[model samples]
Target: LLPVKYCKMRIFSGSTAAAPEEEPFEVWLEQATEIAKEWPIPEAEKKRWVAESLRGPALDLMHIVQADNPSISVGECLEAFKQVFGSTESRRTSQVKYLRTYQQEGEKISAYVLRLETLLRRAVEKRAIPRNIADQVRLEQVMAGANLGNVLWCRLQELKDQGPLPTFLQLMKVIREEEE
Candidate 1:
């Protein structure tokens, strides 16, 4: 029987079985990662379970299980997946692009700030966004989305460079003044 959704995750699935289609690398990685975590079937048991879950390019790669040495741990298999679909840098870029492009036109400042914070939180999860940088990026996105204007945006950018950056109270002040 398949393990319940709460199963302990393997770094790699032992099966070489593939999915029906080759999902976009990042999309597949995220799903596979979460699924592997939740579906904690025992090692040998996972083989067929994986076969059933995957197909296409991923299915063929499943055959790799046949080749990797018996001593191989889960991380090796996970790395294999990474090699096949190494998109971390690109994925982060697209996420940042999404952050830049996102705009909530009608939401109150509070709601809009919350959404921006959510996006920045996502960037932090990837280990890509330095906390300070994440904060700065959120401000830029919020300012642009709100049409806070270049005069202010430029000033913000200048502050971005000044380093050991002062409190975001500074940025908040700028926004509050602009609203007045």
Candidate 2:
């Protein structure tokens, strides 16, 4: 809900330093999502804002059923926007490749594991990877890429041999204690 301070606002007279360039997709996506969230409009209208926000090659892909005049909708493009951008397989592959050879470069195991976890979260959000397997992917990769030290590796062997399954927290605790 909006507070009194935001109850009334001036009409928009937009100015632009807008350059049509191949702006970074991540940067644009991030800002667009934020704008959608903050814009005072119905969700449908918000989507329209998001749809229109797209510019360049990506924007060109969005169709505005302009007849003699301009008459298109946010809903028309929202699905397309989602469908086209929502393919997570490519993103999943890139993230997976990242964790494959990721190694500590003078960073602590804690930091390494945190980065691993963050990367896994992005992976988890990817539709390519099954939701059920997301955590499994996370667990395996965290252990695989992190500089677990020879001590941790030995501990890992012992833990794996004598367990049903070890929790990520359990392993983290062991590693932290061992690290200390």
Q: What is each predicted model's overall lDDT from 0 to 1?
A: 0.58, 0.57
RMSD of each candidate relative to the true structure: 8.9, 8.0
Minimum summed lDDT over a 10-residue window in model 1 is located at: 7-16
lDDT string, candidate 1, 87-180, tens digits: 4545568576556665456654545555566556556777667775666676667766765566766776777677755355566676556554
Clashes of each: 8, 0
Q: Evaluate residue 13 in candidate 1 and report its C-alpha lDDT on the 0 to 100 scale.
A: 30
lDDT minimum window of 10 residues, candidate 2: 7-16
After the best TM-score superposition of candidate 2, give how far the Cα of residue 84 lies from its true spot, in angstroms: 13
Runs with alpha carbons beyond 4 Å of true place in candidate 2: 1-34, 38-92, 131-139
Tens digits of per-residue lDDT, candidate 2, 41-143, equal: 8765665566555654565555433232244444544444456554345775856555674656887776666666655656656654566655466557766
Q: Clashes in model 1: which pairs? A: 16-62, 17-62, 18-54, 18-55, 18-58, 18-59, 19-54, 19-55
